[PDB]
Design a protein around this ligand. Sequence first.
Ligand SMILES: NS(=O)(=O)c1ccc(NCc2ccco2)cc1
Ligand code: NA
Ligand code: NA
Ligand SMILES: [Zn+2]
Length: 257
Amino acid sequence: HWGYGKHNGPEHWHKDFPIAKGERQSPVDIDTHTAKYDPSLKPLSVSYDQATSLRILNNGHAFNVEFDDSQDKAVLKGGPLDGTYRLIQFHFHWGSLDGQGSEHTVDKKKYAAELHLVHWNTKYGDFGKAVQQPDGLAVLGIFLKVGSAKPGLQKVVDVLDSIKTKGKSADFTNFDPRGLLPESLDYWTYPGSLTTPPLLECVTWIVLKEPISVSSEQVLKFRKLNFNGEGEPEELMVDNWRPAQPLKNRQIKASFK
Ligand SMILES: NS(=O)(=O)c1ccc(NCc2ccco2)cc1
Ligand code: NA
Ligand code: NA
Ligand SMILES: [Zn+2]
């Protein structure tokens, strides 16, 4: 029964998910002046040309665009990662207004939204086994600011009317996630967690420095989705973000000088 409201939101999650107060929780504030350049990091290898999207689902928290991960197709390698991580889904977090919505912050700045491309380490065979491991997942995070439209996002925007309420899904084949990336792959990285329950501490976070621009109209359509199911009182799907958590004994590394 967790969610993002006053009575089931981030301040309550620890009661059913005590790892919420753990040692490597996400998101975090990225303090740009103390994140040290690491020359031992590698360029990120994002190989999405063979991605096979399947479906888009309103899960009552966000919407997920799901991929066929049954074989090595869309994969993330390099950067801080050892081995190969397979894309399973992407989703966003966003605000009720443009001045909030991101989960990570940069020198305390909140972006209007944040895209998470979720990948699992193929050495563990399946996503469920990967989330029992401290290096099971890699999430590529991309900030959204409001300005010019993002052409590669429009196909997502235009299907949202058909998945307004929790539990609705729609076919979403032949979507190219390369259209959601910025120009630069410069990034920050740190060890963290899922940002929603069960809050598992499995994630190598890779957060791109360059935001993507989306238009006001694109993000406004995100905000017309519903947390509730069909026939229930309308609760707009907005402010589905967790605030920054304590950094504790962690270092954020920069891939760029
Ligand atoms: N916001 S996020 O990128 O950290 C993220 C990514 C993936 C899941 N998955 C949730 C799940 C299902 C079974 C175990 O866990 C939850 C949150
Ligand atoms: Na540091
Ligand atoms: Na297959
Ligand atoms: Zn997320």
